[PDB]
Amino acid sequence: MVKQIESKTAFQEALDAAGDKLVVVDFSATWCGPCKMIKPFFHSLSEKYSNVIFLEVDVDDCQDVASECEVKCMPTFQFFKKGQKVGEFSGANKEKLEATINELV
Numbered sequence: 001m002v003k004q005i006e007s008k009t010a011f012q013e014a015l016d017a018a019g020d021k022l023v024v025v026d027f028s029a030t031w032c033g034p035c036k037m038i039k040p041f042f043h044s045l046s047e048k049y050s051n052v053i054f055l056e057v058d059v060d061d062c063q064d065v066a067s068e069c070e071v072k073c074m075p076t077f078q079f080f081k082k083g084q085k086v087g088e089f090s091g092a093n094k095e096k097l098e099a100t101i102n103e104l105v
């Protein structure tokens with residue numbers, strides 16, 4: 001299951017609620033083609049890694065001031081443990097996505 005995160009407060013609360021679980025965040029845009037191509041794989045991963053938390057952010061929802069949306073290329077995947085960013089890369093590369101979850105879990 002992937003949780004859609006639509007605000008900064010929801011984002012921060014999700015990272016706190018995770019506890020010791022790895023958190024994976026897909027920052028995507030509804031106009032980005034490669035984001036569409038990888039999205040069902042991201043949801044498949046969420047069923048597989050059932051103790052990892054998967055969040056999706058539509059960057060059109062990012063605040064213009066004081067945002068946690070610190071990204072440049074779509075899609076961007078960020079990885080957090082106990083609220084700290086522990087990994088990040090951009091690009092719809094499925095093998096790199098699953099490899100990074102395994103490296104950080």
Ligand SMILES: [Cl-]
Binds near residue numbers: 049
């Ligand atoms: Cl897991």
